[PDB]
Design a binder for this molecule. Structure first.
Ligand SMILES: Cc1cc2nc3c(=O)[nH]c(=O)nc-3n(C[C@H](O)[C@H](O)[C@H](O)COP(=O)(O)OP(=O)(O)OC[C@H]3O[C@@H](n4cnc5c(N)ncnc54)[C@H](O)[C@@H]3O)c2cc1C
Length: 455
């Protein structure tokens, strides 16, 4: 059969491989993965006696039309409940009014809905200013955390970097978001296991994809191929088709050396224009819980902060002021979330510094200087991960939904194909977008092979 190489073993690459290998008449296919494991941004780790998810954690919109929900159900990865609660702490050591929280959430999320109905950030700030003394500062402080939560959601440093006009293109499927009781990496491990033996090569990063050529294979019959995949280890792999599923952050940093000749101008510009920000998780293990047992999300409100003063490239007073709060993981574990440049800075700190700094933050925020220190920390480092360089894509100011279609556009003769979350116009930044993109590329190849047969 035709020689196919898939670059990257995340859900997009695995989905593309799954669909191509399932074909009763299958191609000769290999998946080349840079790192030691499969799953990419789906990464479940044994920690604190349980499982921590360093990447994807939720199925967004777990309903019939969500292929990730469909697969998790087929694999037995969902809990019974899935198959059918916040505490607000100020940086002053006091609780925040539930009524004021509701008022600000109604103002903020009402405006988010309106943006989906220049930048998202600028629209939100202009409207909030029109809506706008200790009650005023409190209201602006609450709003500041809501902006920081939207930064985590979009995977951006600032909502001022998020394009307004394309914002509504992102599709949210019905259903309350759920986790996988069976762990998220169980999904990618199951797909990987369905592939023929030795389909995936680990610790095998690709250096350059050479295309638009006539490359002779090493052995008889010295058959010529249009593509040659050059690995970092010197491996010289001829192919008829290469499906690239590498993250947009990797493409932004290396597209100039990763493709030979360079990509067509429109695709090279799409890579540069689209957003690719950082969102990280900080898991903190505690000997005893200090929060209410019914609590699920501890939202932190930073006193005297405001989103109206902030611009696209402004930093918070300290890196930890960008942290939104903590999700209780139901050992006693909390998961803090932090996006953007402050999150990239956190990655440069040692584990000890993060643990000590967040212990001091929690002591301040709870109004308890005796609060025991976290016993252990486990944090994601997505921006410094060399084969990812960030968390997920967004349609940045200066880019549009057409740029996500340009990411998906194949190279001549389908020599090189493109899948991955940043190739999906309406489900970018999700596991289902990434999965659907892999299936899309497999389907595109099958049509070409069916057409070669017919002629
Ligand atoms: C912190 C975080 C939280 C998230 N939360 C959610 C959530 O709750 N729900 C959700 O739906 N989505 C979420 N996402 C997004 C989701 O995880 C991704 O959109 C999706 O998993 C990406 O799949 P992919 O196949 O496109 O890319 P990846 O999973 O990143 O796979 C790409 C692969 O290519 C490999 N690679 C890179 N360069 C090379 C090279 N040169 N040679 C060979 N291989 C290479 C990488 O090592 C990697 O394995 C989150 C992501 C992060 C990081």
């Amino acid at each position: 059969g035709p020689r196919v190489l898939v670059v990257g073993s995340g859900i997009a690459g695995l989905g593309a491989a799954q669909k191509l290998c399932s074909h009763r008449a299958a191609p000769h296919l290999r998946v080349l993965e840079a790192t030691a494991s499969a799953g990419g941004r789906i990464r479940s780790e044994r920690c604190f006696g349980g499982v921590v998810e360093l990447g994807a954690h939720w199925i967004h919109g777990p309903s019939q039309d969500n292929p990730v929900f469909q697969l998790a159900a087929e694999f037995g990865l969902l809990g019974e409940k899935e198959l059918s609660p916040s505490m607000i702490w100020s940086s002053s050591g006091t609780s925040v009014s539930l009524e004021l929280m509701t008022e600000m959430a109604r103002l903020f999320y009402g405006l988010i809905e309106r943006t989906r109905e220049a930048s998202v950030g600028e629209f939100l700030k202009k409207e909030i200013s029109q809506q706008v003394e200790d009650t005023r500062k409190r209201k602006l402080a609450i709003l500041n955390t809501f902006f920081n939560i939207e930064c985590c959601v979009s995977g951006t440093h600032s909502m001022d970097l998020v394009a307004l006009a394309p914002f509504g293109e992102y599709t949210v499927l019905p259903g309350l978001d759920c986790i996988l009781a069976g762990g998220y990496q169980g999904l990618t491990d199951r797909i990987l296991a369905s592939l023929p033996k030795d389909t995936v090569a680990f610790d095998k990063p690709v250096k350059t994809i050479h295309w638009n050529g006539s490359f002779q294979e090493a052995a008889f019959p010295g058959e010529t191929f249009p593509v040659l995949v050059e690995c970092e280890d010197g491996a010289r792999l001829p192919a008829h088709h290469v499906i690239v599923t590498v993250p947009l952050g990797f493409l932004k940093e290396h597209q100039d050396t990763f493709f030979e000749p360079p990509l067509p101008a429109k695709k090279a510009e799409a890579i540069k224009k689209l957003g690719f920000g950082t969102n990280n998780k900080i898991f903190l293990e505690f000997e005893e819980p200090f929060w209410e047992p019914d609590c699920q999300f501890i939202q932190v409100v930073w006193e005297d902060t405001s989103p109206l003063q902030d611009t696209a490239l402004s930093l918070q007073d300290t890196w930890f002021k960008k942290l939104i709060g903590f999700l209780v993981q139901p050992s006693h574990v909390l998961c803090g979330f932090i996006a953007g440049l402050e999150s990239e800075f956190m990655e440069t700190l040692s584990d000890e510094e993060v643990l000590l700094s967040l212990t001091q933050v929690l002591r301040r925020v709870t109004g308890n200087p005796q609060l025991p220190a976290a016993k252990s920390v486990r944090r994601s480092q997505w921006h410094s991960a060399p084969y990812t360089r960030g968390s997920y894509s967004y349609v940045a100011v200066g880019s549009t939904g057409d740029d996500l279609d340009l990411m998906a556009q194949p190279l001549p003769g389908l020599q090189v194909l493109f899948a991955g979350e940043a190739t999906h116009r309406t489900f970018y930044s999700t596991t289902h977008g990434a999965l659907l993109s892999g299936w899309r590329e497999a389907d595109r190849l099958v049509s070409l092979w069916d057409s070669q047969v017919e002629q």
